[model samples]
Target chain A: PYLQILEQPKQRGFRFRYVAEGPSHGGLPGASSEKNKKSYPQVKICNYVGPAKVIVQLVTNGKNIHLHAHSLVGKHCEDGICTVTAGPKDMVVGFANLGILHVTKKKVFETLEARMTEACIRGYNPGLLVHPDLAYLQAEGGGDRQLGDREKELIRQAALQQTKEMDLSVVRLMFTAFLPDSTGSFTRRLEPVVSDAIYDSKAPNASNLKIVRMDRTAGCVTGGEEIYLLCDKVQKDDIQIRFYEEEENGGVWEGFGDFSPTDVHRQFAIVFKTPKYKDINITKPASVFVQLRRKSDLETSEPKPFLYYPE
Target chain B: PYLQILEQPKQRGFRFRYVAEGPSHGGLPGASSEKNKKSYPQVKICNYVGPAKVIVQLVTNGKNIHLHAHSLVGKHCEDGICTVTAGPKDMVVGFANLGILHVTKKKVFETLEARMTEACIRGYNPGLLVHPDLAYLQAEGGGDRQLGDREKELIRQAALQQTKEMDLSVVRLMFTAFLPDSTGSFTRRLEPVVSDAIYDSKAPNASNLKIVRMDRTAGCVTGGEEIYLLCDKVQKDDIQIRFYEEEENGGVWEGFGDFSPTDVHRQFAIVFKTPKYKDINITKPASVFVQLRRKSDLETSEPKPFLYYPE
Candidate 1:
């Protein structure tokens, strides 16, 4: 059940990082590690999320055998400098390229999970899941260039032995996710953007609709002022915002004027002005609850509190 | 590149199911989908949790092509049938097996996300995340039976066409995970249980332990009876249970005696007698709250309310 290539004694020092979105795409489409050494020695994590490409540099002799490809938990690798959702862990990745195999080691210092913890957010997004540092299997050369039986069998045997020495139980388990890469920087770069949506791999029910965070949790401005709401898993459409006022006696809740969506809006955010309270005729100020209701699903968010003061 | 065996035009109707711990193990190891028609025609889901195995029955022609093994999002397919974690969606899986190609479809009738909606439960657990039905690819026949250049090329072309027609964007993505089969019956069956722990791919920072669905949520008796807490993602130590009084005001809370781990304990569950509240020295009855708190991290779960009757 294990990929013979990955069974080779695991290699170390194969670290990868995503380079800043550059004017030119970093790695070549079909370049081998041997060729990459002259042009680029360091492999950059894919700049875009999902099924990313990264250069795998063999710091040492690099064996140059046929390496097996394996996926670690967390979509971290599907063999080729693959990216995954998140978590701090080690990934064993191998791939046969140009009949030569490469297996490398990577320490996932940061993952989408870790980042979410740091940012304090939840919900899965193909875009938000980024694996900063990881190793992957990159295979080059196929067809006629295939290795001879003796060599291939030897490699497979070595891999089997390696699997026996390491953790064979894990070797037996198989995991795969198409969009294995996990690096993304909201960029306009043509290279990454071309295939971004096709590889998003959003949840089957993903509607691109989520309220990640709001600029102001508590607002004190009067009648008509702009408040921004940061969101995710969203789309550009009829999104409504409503304010609720608690009845003096705590009976039924009262609804106020809606926040018009005529101003600035994007998939990630919505800017709107608050409506003045009719009861503002009172010299005293009051607080009201606000919520964003998606017109599509009629799903109401947990109410956020806003402090309204006398102008 | 692509697996030659998986290069065939994909066949639909390859479904999977999870059967509760059965008496006998199902699905033949290393059995190709093409030959299974004579023995087992139907595919059953795994009965036990962990890396599962299900028969991949090629219902119709049961094409002679080899299956290309692959993992979709969570489910890993090497041979027989397998099990995976949760998420609300279907995964396109492919793999290279025995040099033969097979593509089967198993509808993901119920995912952890969907089940939670029906059962109203949350928190990730490998058990609760059962893929009742879904599609998969299977393959066999390689090495000595390697395909001729013409046949391999034809299959590759067909696969490329099929990929283009189905979803090329997805086809380009690659994913793999070890411990692919999930058809174990919790025995030394030399099948699923041999190395279950080695393949349990718990999420990184996977501390979101949950009490899936306990046998009983409400306890009628006060102290003599045993209460069971079915849990997931748990370790043996540093876990404590505390009962809190609801309090008259409904705001403040009071603590009560703890449920020590004298008996009935496993990583996934805890069965212990309820601590007596008789010492309260009150004639009236009252309800209290129960919650599990991780002493190691001081993380406490939401308190579940239980009613108490006068003796």
Candidate 2:
């Protein structure tokens, strides 16, 4: 596998300054300043692949991957707000601590670096400044302790060179809106119905879940834009669970029990424990579908072998 | 009309270094860490800009605007963020109270410098290192600092260059997704519309009050998107208000009972009243519309003027 080096923005000993024309800081999120001239400084980073748990590895050379289980927190740590500490395992990069992602070829390094920069400065967190207690803002004694002016100058120069290298960086992994398979599997078709009930109702269970969902049962078959999977059951006559796309755009299923067997069917899991809750809610089990573009080397842009995953 | 020469990247004692990776304290909105990393060793002019109330004179040198505002805050004021008190009014230069803006710009200057070096180190916020507000982590008289060896190298270099300019070289403005109308206005749009029933169900003597969304009015007139403006009055009769996109996208009813009337009907003064409210709901008012791309600018491929208000 090739490598990608995504470097976050270099930490400056400074902060973000907010200076708007009107009632400055009045409408701003932080800082209690009354004068319209008051300004506040904070910083933010934005735009990394979402719903992902990435382990940040720092490496001098690209051989070993050091993994520590530290709580991962950043500007968009959880739900996109600056926080001093993100709760435990909210985002678990590999092992837990930061790791170095190594790239051998200079071109690869530069290209990966460029993409990572894009991710850092996309500036999506609006009207808020990220301040982490883990990070140091300035040095002790308040004199030029940490970063000297000349060093800053050098960093600036390096930044310029990096910018040039970044002019042409790695090709991004383009993402198509995850389209549901309409005619493939029974589960896929049922997805629309389940999704309709969950997302449309705004009911408590449906909250915090996306419309494109998944069902992970062992005995299910994949076909016709849907999949039917049987729950692990002692009896062969267990009710079948299926997923499909909704007939109407953005439709959701409200009453999931209507589609299930009304009788109190005996099952192995049922015998063991009740459902997570009593309601026959259309639950989004731990599985999803994605169509990923094949990875290719930068510059060469050669076609790589196709790799697919079915769940 | 005269012009003044601003410092170039090469001249006026600018250098680059990479600070440990984190969000920049000051940088353009949507400016990424990668960009920040590459843009290291940026120019840092001290005593140049600070956020305080000050008078400024804009004299033209050969081609550019030479904006001369008062220097940084004298060792007198007691404020976290300061700014030049006047204008956002125009034509009055040779200023007094060079406001909060000056401070913000100074912050930007420092972050730019630190990123100049070590552009590859991944810095951690000690706050995130342990638990939220680590009981041991106290901001007091004597706690060990976290500026590691790399950080020291960065600071030492910063000290050498343009020492006189070092103090006031702060970042003035930063571009980010949350500054009213950046691309992240999706949050603004996605904000839930609750209490619709409340709006529809009003009192009998409520006057000609109608829940005219500020963004809606602005969007209708400008043929753009509608936004929810925080108003004093939920309803008003024929009140024409303009949108202040810069100030977190607010709407003002042109005509109402009193200019700052507390007794007015649905008309609003539209001030940023709440200091801190958990935006757990993710409902940003509709004012985020103005920052949307201007059709003319996009079509012409010309520099789009800032998204702001008339006054």
Candidate 3:
């Protein structure tokens, strides 16, 4: 039996929480989560679903496969993992509540190695099945107990140097399903499916964009007028003040406001100049829209109306 | 000899603080106060200057003048008034830090009457010189201080009946300069000159007008585009989103954004549409400016740039 992803987890804007911050900051959102309509990460055991078992684990998104230090937490989760049973045919299980427990930065490598070790010893491997000999951190402080001697610190330094340089901004969830066999053991496993990359909300380029205040609301149609725009947190080099027009028939003309990285103030404000309208010869006022758009992903804030006028 | 105003105190944007709000919420600004440059309330002895004493008192701006309950508290000030001596001829005196001490609303009339009674009794009258028989308040609560029985309520009811509908929004500073006479008394009084009206910063129709944010920054040259503008406190009926242009040779063009009072949200936001440009047939981008302008006093915020595109 193969597993199908009915709904993917939301790829961005969800802040992964540190363990000390506790849990229940609301589960990860699904791709379709909205103010008026909500949905969540969902999966189904397709073709055959008579009490099939499914397990989920956090995994690295790089070319080098490795288990993640962060844990999957929330309802029906234990020891940083999620396991569920599909009830019969055509049944889909929706994970409406699942939080990410971000391991402390200093302890990331230890947690990752401990998690892999536990998976190897207990035969509970999901994403780290091939890496069975993952017990190097146990030589130092990653044990179930406490720290020992500074003399044992050598192993920590050596182990931490191999911390794998993981990209903290993103992670993916691997879902593996197993079907029951004659011996009542759910051992016939299907190929695992890795979901989309989930971005850390605190990543500078990934923050939510909003315009707080503007020194001026309207400018000239010939453009190149100064504007002081107050906004939510933004990365200077990765942001663009976009002015664009969309026709009812789907035609578009877009231009960027003139600014340099030095013009972004305290990350909350931007000093930019307006872009000249496509038709500077127009005799009447023309209207368009403006927004803060990301350079990498093209994510944009809600638009503000702008007007261009003639000489 | 006469008194000449060297600098006029800023009339608006200075909030009148209640007595309980303590003191030192900054001083009244001068009419020319700017970020990089500043001046303050100043006056000079025009024809003569050496050893001239000047006393400043707060007075009501109405046709029937009365002493104001609010006090002028700052350097060289005592008992709600300011006393200064001109150093010499051709010298101007600047009151750089003069705060207005607003009285409690419940006791406004009592304070005004007590102030007037003391002025008449001590022969310290300035603006209230014409109304010298101001001792009716001493019969009851306004005495050096306590409330009397309802049995003594007759005098208070009759006394408080003349509280005068004082305009709290404005007060005028009366500066009376005196030169010493043969009897060694500085009784050679110049005409008491009242300064321009100072407005309470919190007055609804008089508060500072600012465009905090706009949802859109550009629109079509045809105009009529929706814009959500966040703003500092504003009176909808008295505020206008003005768009204007200035020429190199001192010519000008101006228009207003479109919206009704209902389009203003909670005094901090205005959902307005753009105004049509004076010309609509131009094929090139033309630039202009915009600001939050007060209809009555013509106060305006710093402008922002906007752009309009062709159809």
Candidate 4:
């Protein structure tokens, strides 16, 4: 999670130059001398990072639109890089409520901090920019408004570290000026600015240590027949393969004999022969669950199903 | 789909007894003791074959319930065997709307035919049962239907042969009665009967030759790195493996050099190395489609995806 909100805006204190690109004119919205314009400017969050839902609001000419965080797709903090876009193209330009913006550099963060202090001293409420994930961690324990000193300290330390390493900081706002339908040309403005700094504490990579699937969904084999179990990741040593009886309701998963992996198999593949069914009287077809476990720990993979048929 | 509906009833044509079973007494609706009442009669289809939407109607004391074909699960026409069932325990007893009937024998078919003739001659519109698949073939085209006078003679010969070979022909019907609040003991009658014959003209086995999946969904492998492609139902013959460049808008699936399969590999496993990137100018990572075709025929499986990275 790498979205950061740096400065919150208030009435009259938020001022910035605006630029727009569209089909009609070659200059910014208000300055262009062209007549009969046809297109408007749009804003977007080009690169998205972070966990909690992020919302962006654009206010111009007393009209405002909001962009909710879930609409944008990217490799969340799940992947360390936060460079995101609507699709293959990277330019986050279009209608303000539906566009993607570019990632800002570290220098922009410094400039926004200086601007925020000047506005705070002017007796304005000046809204606050907050990291959605960080805010949730602090607010969730007691009610959201009831604060504790220790929680505030945790948020501060985490936010400080996130500011140094995370990206996604720039904001783009677009507006269009156009004539009536089926008429002439239009002009608009486009500007880049900083809204706030929000931090998405890195979500730890949960170990992807489970089996994706077996080469075969189910196979019919007898004792002494060989089979393979394909998995995601595995270590060269200390892996144990066990078979268990399938039961109804909450019957115990009774474990049978363990099978050892041979050197001929790849790191992600295990080859083993079927152990004799536990019930010697079982001269018929039956089903069992195959599971993998690591000897160094109590962790085990979700069981894969296998069928045993009598010769 | 090997279900056959035997009888269709008119306003007052169909008649049968009812029985309910649960944690209660075993008796008909009004009779507690009777020495010579015909109270133990039941109904069932002794034999089922071919693919058709079969419907079973139950009428007791002027109240009736209908069972549509799809609700029952078993071997459709796709599977050669027509032995149908509700499950392993063949009591075939349950709520009427949610129950499965049993397959009957040849004797029941003859007996039902005799009973049907008597009802038909008595000025009643005797209902008919037909198989869905067989009905389709018979109704396909007027021209094709007329072409088989001799062919029709051949079909009659084949029908006689099937009757000699089929074994499923024992029928039983079960119905249950209940009390309000969904709790009550129920009684049902089990009877044996037979319907018309149907055949699930068998579909010949086609070669299942294709790539199942690669060990990895996306891999960053340099040229000459080893990889494995698992497949289903492949024969030991001239199987060809080729690579095609991933294209933007229908680019030629240019064939790459063939990867030979050796005897050391298992029946369904193919081991090969990544061919060198086609263009030496291609210095970045690229994705390619992997495909398999049989040299004996023009048949090929859907392509699987593979990624190649620079050396």
Interface RMSD of each: 20.4, 25.0, 8.5, 7.2
> What's the TM-score of chain A alone for every prediction?
0.30, 0.18, 0.84, 0.31
- Pick the DockQ winner: 3
Ranking by TM-score: 3, 4, 1, 2
lDDT (Cα, tens digit) per residue for candidate 4, span A1-311: 12222223211111122112222222112112247942323234334321112222321111121111111112221111122222224233332112222223444334333222221222111122223333333212433344456544544443353345433322222121111122321111112233422221111111234555454434344355455555544554666666677467767554443345542144455555556665544566677877776666445678877776655
lDDT of 2 by residue, A1-35 (tens): 11122222212111122112221211112122447
Model 3 Cα lDDT, one tens digit per residue, A1-311? 67889999998878888887888597888898467866888888778755877878887777756667778899868777788887875468778678888877677787765665454433454224323333323222334344234313433443354356766667898887877776767756677778988888877877878886666778888788888776877888899999999989999989899999987765767779999888877777888888999999998898988887786
Give DockQ for candidates 1 onward, in order: 0.01, 0.01, 0.02, 0.02
lDDT tens digits, residue span B120-145, model 4: 22211122221222222321323333
Ranking by lDDT: 3, 4, 1, 2
Model 1 RMSD to the real structure?
A: 27.6
- What are the chain B TM-scores of all models? 0.30, 0.16, 0.84, 0.33
True contacts kept of 4: 0.00
Off by over 4 Å in 1: A1-311, B1-206, B215-222, B248-264, B278-285
Q: What shift in Å separates residue A32 of candidate 1 from its native position after superposition?
A: 56
Q: How big is the positional error of residue B279 in model 2, measured in Å on the Cα after superposition? A: 34
- Fnat: each model in turn: 0.00, 0.00, 0.00, 0.00
Q: Which is the winner by TM-score between candidate 2 and candidate 4? A: 4
Candidate 3: what lDDT?
0.73
